[PDB]
Amino acid sequence: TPEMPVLENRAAQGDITAPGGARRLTGDQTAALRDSLSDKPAKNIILLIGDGMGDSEITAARNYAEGAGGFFKGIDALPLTGQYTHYALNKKTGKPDYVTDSAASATAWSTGVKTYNGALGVDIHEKDHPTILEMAKAAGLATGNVSTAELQDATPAALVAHVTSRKCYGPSATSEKCPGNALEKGGKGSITEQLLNARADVTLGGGAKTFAETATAGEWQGKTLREQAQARGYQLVSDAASLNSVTEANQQKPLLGLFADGNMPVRWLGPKATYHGNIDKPAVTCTPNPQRNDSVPTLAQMTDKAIELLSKNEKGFFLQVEGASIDKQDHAANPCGQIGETVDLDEAVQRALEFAKKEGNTLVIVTADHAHASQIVAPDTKAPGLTQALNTKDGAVMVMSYGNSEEDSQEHTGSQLRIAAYGPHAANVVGLTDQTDLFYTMKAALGLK
Amino acid sequence: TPEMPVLENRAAQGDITAPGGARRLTGDQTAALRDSLSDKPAKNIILLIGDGMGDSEITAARNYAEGAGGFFKGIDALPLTGQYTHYALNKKTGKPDYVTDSAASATAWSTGVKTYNGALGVDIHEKDHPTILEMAKAAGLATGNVSTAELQDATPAALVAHVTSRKCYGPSATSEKCPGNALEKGGKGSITEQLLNARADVTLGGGAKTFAETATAGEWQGKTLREQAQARGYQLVSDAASLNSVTEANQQKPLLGLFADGNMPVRWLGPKATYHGNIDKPAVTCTPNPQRNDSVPTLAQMTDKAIELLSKNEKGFFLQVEGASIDKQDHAANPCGQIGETVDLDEAVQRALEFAKKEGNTLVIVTADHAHASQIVAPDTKAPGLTQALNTKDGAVMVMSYGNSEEDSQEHTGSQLRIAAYGPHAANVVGLTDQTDLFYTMKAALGLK
Ligand SMILES: [Mg+2]
Ligand SMILES: [Mg+2]
Ligand SMILES: [Zn+2]
Ligand SMILES: [Zn+2]
Ligand SMILES: [Zn+2]
Ligand SMILES: [Zn+2]
């Protein structure tokens, strides 16, 4: 019994050139929205973050993959929607820094405190604040942490580690960039060491590389972090078959999936955007990346297995899933990698909704940490930045532009962006809210102290 | 009691550097949302359009005027929000054209049919479709059309005109660019001539210039459009005191206010953005326009005046208010003008909401016709385009970048964007919708046949 409805189909209902044909609605939505409102407790929370997936990115991706009048069966199917602010702070002044990085933002929703760009799980005075994940676990809930990036990257790291700089991946960088956190200096350790201490039930992503580092102190000095993980009782999996093999994941036997040395392979290949690329160069059709792999689980497969594993815990679970590479390909000004990552996220959202619809007590939230550079501009545009023309599903040309930096990497932007949710407590994302409100929304939905 | 609540306080709750200090919400919003939902018929509708007012635009303006943690008492106060799509169509192919102009988008909300860039009140086969304004009149409702641009501009023109080119301001341009619409060649006439026929109860904006033009055919041949107007019973006003004097406006004595020759003056002045301005030039503090005049009514006063007059109508009213210059100052790469026109619209929204709170049967809508170029970037950004650093209310620097055009005009972008609403039938803007759905929601809310 699907008590709470998801939006089944908001594509254009007919011929886009005729009166009414471009409509996404088929009648009045009052009753359906009323039906979507419940203040019942949530047993579970599934948080889905598209890194750098602002409104522009969602739009670009839908145009390409589904057509202008198409509809993301995952992404767009959430019925309660609003916009949220993600500004960070200046460490020195305490004033807003209008354009956050991935670390400050993730700290925001995972602790409820704003912070400076580059920080993870600490405020501007460098104090540690518990994360929603540490809280959930303290409360007896099963916990999951899933990303396509290296596990040390800002997004997934924010839930498990509190370091003064997001660069502090392992022992080596930590000694140098985060002296105060360094193990050998009496600190809590590097991001990777804290991730191992945090012990979520399920952790799946890339970044095996840093696991080859050896600890500088403590019980496992001299051994590699990979070796400490095994010594600590973690089940290590490194390919989709092994992941599929897992039947249990808990505090006694927690799961650690390391599927790449660095970030996981992107879904789609395309050339990088160029100066006047839309005028000089022919239109691009994105193509599947041969290195993607059958041996490499996709995001939706990771999401599906975590939910399976976590759903066995009777008090409920907290799960965050990251579509990491949307931001990474947006910095690289690679349309194809970018949109291909958003499609990949949409598949993961679909798995989360199928579960929640059935369960009836699951709040699913889909948003981004911040906005990014990409823009959709007219086909004959002559822009100072990098552009590329792409052939969409509609059989038309869309041009994408990246013109926010002369430097090599395209930059984040400060615009407020879409947050959407489904399930109990979802009402709290409607309207204008702040990214820190999301921590409180989650805490409250879960009934956490 | 205003059963229908408006968001009263969505500003950050306390000290932004402390846990929970940046929250916008005071508690759970489920109940409040339940209470904002009604399927009752709307008696009145007030549609407020910020031209080019995408999420980026709202964010920049809020940051500057209200601070990062601030809140627009009008714009941000609408409780039901979503994101809508505004793509246009390619005239030849009927395939989507991902980035719309102001005419195609206005046509979409005003008629319910997608069209080509440059079309007003016609579809891709150059055929006329009735507009919401036309239909409301036909039904006996009072009608209003207000804007700070030239009244012949795309936005206001779309409610009252059907021309193949938005450039067809008057007889002269019409005979040249829209022959088929030319009064002489048997057409409905130029935009201004059709505006005179549509006979809205209240029409307020700029564009006096074109009214000096003389009619080439019809009953008022050889007379200027101004004479034709007074000749057809319009009550002409050209200033605030004249405007204030009006005690009635109706089909018998319709009101026509021409407050300026071209566009009404912008609120705020500032320098244009320049290459490396955030680096090479000092941060800018916007200056009030000394020449904006006490003799020229502000958008909010026109708004307040239109409601008083239209509201005398017992059957109900439809009203359209445009903050036209956000878009034009976005094109001009002028942060101060762009932001100033957003603050200006916010004051108009407040007026609409105040009336709506009290009346109880008013559906109020706030959106934009498409997205724009401006982006909020990091202070030390080195961008290939035009930039400016600004000093905000927080006492920090915000940087704005315009980098999607090498030409002297910064372009529109195709991102989906916020649409927000308050009152009866407002659920219809929640989630993902298309700009065409807005026509259908308004028509059904009012019960127009
Ligand atoms: Mg990330
Ligand atoms: Mg306009
Ligand atoms: Zn990020
Ligand atoms: Zn990034
Ligand atoms: Zn426009
Ligand atoms: Zn424009």
The ranges assigned to domains in chain B are 1-449
Closest chain A residue by Cα to residue B419? A82
B36–A contact, CB cutoff 8 A: no
Contact A372, A366 (CB under 8 A): no
Tell me if B129 is assigned to a ligand binding site: no
DSSP letter, residue B116: B
Q: How far is residue A422's CA from residue A364's CA, in Å, rounded to a whole number? A: 5
Q: How far is residue B245's CA from residue B238's CA, in Å, rounded to a whole number? A: 11
| A96/B63 CB distance under 8 A | yes
SS3 content of chain B, % helix, strand, coil (to 5): 30, 20, 50
Residue A110: CB partners within 8 Å, gap ≥ 6? A121, A131, A132, A133, A158, A159, A439
Tell me if B372 is assigned to a ligand binding site: no
Residue B349: CB partners within 8 Å, gap ≥ 6? B48, B72, B74, B75, B77, B364, B366
Return phi, psi of residue A45, to 5°: -135, 125
As a dihedral over the C-alpha atoms of residue A425, residue A426, residue A428, residue A429, rounded to 10 degrees, the angle is 160
Within 264-323 of B, beta carbons closer than 8 Å to A belong to: none
Neighbours of ion ligand 4 (CB under 5 A): A 327
Q: How far is residue B196's CA from residue B186's CA, in Å, rounded to a whole number? A: 17
3-state secondary structure of A316: coil
Contact B348, B342 (CB under 8 A): no
Q: Which residues pair with B85 in a beta bridge?
A: B434
Q: Enumerate the residues of chain A whose CB falls inside 8 A of the CB of residue B31.
A: 39
> Which secondary structure element, helix H or strand E, spans residue B242, and what is its range?
helix B240-245
Active site residues of A: 102
Ligand nearest to the CA of A155: 1
DSSP notation for A377-403: E-TT---SSEEEEEE-TTSSEEEEEE-
Q: How far is residue B349's CA from residue B307's CA, in Å, rounded to a whole number? A: 12
Tell me if B331 is assigned to a ligand binding site: yes
Structure tokens belonging to residue A77: 């199917």
Single-letter amino acid, residue A274: T
Tell me if B304 is assigned to a ligand binding site: no
| B18/A93 CB distance under 8 A | no
| Burial of B167 per CB tally in 10 Å (0-12, 13-18, 19+) | middle
Q: How far is residue A250's CA from residue A133's CA, in Å, rounded to a whole number? A: 14
Q: How far is residue A13's CA from residue A20's CA, in Å, rounded to a whole number? A: 8
Residue B232: CB partners within 8 Å, gap ≥ 6? B196, B199
Cβ–Cβ contacts within 10 Å for residue B291, how many? 9
| B33/A29 CB distance under 8 A | no
| Number of residues written out for chain A | 449
| B68/A96 CB distance under 8 A | yes
Tell me if A304 is assigned to a ligand binding site: no
Q: From the CA atom positions of chain B, what is the Rg in Å?
A: 21
Query: How far does the centroid of ligand 5 lie from the alpha carbon of residue B154, in Å?
Result: 8
Contact B87, B413 (CB under 8 A): no
> Which secondary structure element, helix H or strand E, spans residue B353, and what is its range?
helix B335-359
* Residue whose token pair is 């038309």: A396
Cβ–Cβ contacts within 10 Å for residue B272, how many? 15
Query: How far does the centroid of ligand 4 lie from the alpha carbon of residue A417, in Å?
Result: 15
DSSP letter, residue A210: G
Structure tokens belonging to residue A115: 């912070």
| A16/B114 CB distance under 8 A | yes
DSSP notation for B43-112: SEEEEEEETT--HHHHHHHHHHHT-TT---TTGGG-SEEEEEE--EE-TTT--EESS--HHHHHHHHHHS
Å between B31 CA and nearest CA of chain A = 8
| A434/B24 CB distance under 8 A | yes
| A16/B94 CB distance under 8 A | yes
Locate breaks in chain A with C to N over 2.5 A; list the residue preceding each. Answer: none
Within 396-425 of A, beta carbons closer than 8 Å to B belong to: 396, 398, 401, 403-407, 411-418, 420, 425
CA distances for A278 relative to A22, A391, B2, B258, angstroms: 28, 11, 53, 43
| A431/B87 CB distance under 8 A | no
Tell me if A294 is assigned to a ligand binding site: no
Ligand nearest to the CA of B155: 2
| A383/B376 CB distance under 8 A | no
Query: How far does the centroid of ligand 4 lie from the alpha carbon of residue A332, in Å?
Result: 10
Contact B257, B238 (CB under 8 A): yes
Q: Enumerate the residues of chain A whose CB falls inside 8 A of the CB of residue B11.
A: none
Q: A31-57 as b/e, with b when 16 or more CB fall inside 10 Å? A: ebbeebbbbeebbbbbbbbbbbbbbbb
Cβ–Cβ contacts within 10 Å for residue A316, how many? 21
SS3 sequence, B252-313?
CCCEEEECCCCCCCCCEECCCCECCHHHHCCCECCEECCCCCCCCCCHHHHHHHHHHHHCCC
CATH architecture, domain defined by B1-449: 3-Layer(aba) Sandwich (3.40)
Query: How far does the centroid of ligand 5 lie from the alpha carbon of residue B52, in Å?
Result: 5
Ligand nearest to the CA of A158: 1
DSSP letter, residue A105: H
Dihedral sign, Cα of residue A439, residue A165, residue A223, residue A218 = negative
Ligand nearest to the CA of A372: 4
Contact A369, A106 (CB under 8 A): yes
Query: How far does the centroid of ligand 1 lie from the alpha carbon of residue A366, in Å?
Result: 14
Contact A229, A196 (CB under 8 A): yes
Within 346-385 of A, beta carbons closer than 8 Å to B belong to: 371, 373, 375-378, 381-385
Strands A417-422 and A386-391: unpaired
Q: How far is residue A273's CA from residue A277's CA, in Å, rounded to a whole number? A: 6
Closest chain B residue by Cα to residue A68? B96
Contact B409, B331 (CB under 8 A): yes
Return phi, psi of residue A443, to 5°: -60, -50
* Residue whose token pair is 């071209």: B262
3-state secondary structure of A350: helix
Q: Which residues pair with A275 in a beta bridge?
A: A386
Single-letter amino acid, residue B14: G
Query: How far does the centroid of ligand 3 lie from the alpha carbon of residue A318, in Å?
Result: 21
DSSP notation for B201-215: SEEEEE-TGGGGSB-
Q: How far is residue A159's CA from residue A120's CA, in Å, rounded to a whole number? A: 8
DSSP notation for B226-239: HHHHHHTT-EEE-S
Tell me if B370 is assigned to a ligand binding site: yes
Query: How far does the centroid of ligand 4 lie from the alpha carbon of residue A371, in Å?
Result: 9
Q: Enumerate the residues of chain B whose CB falls inside 8 A of the CB of residue A428.
A: 25, 28-30
Structure tokens belonging to residue B391: 């000093």
B69–A contact, CB cutoff 8 A: yes
Chain A interface test: which of B33, B39, B391 (most A C-beta within 10 Å)? B33
Contact A370, A404 (CB under 8 A): no
- Which residue from A114, A382, A420 is facing B405, i.e. has the nearest CB? A382
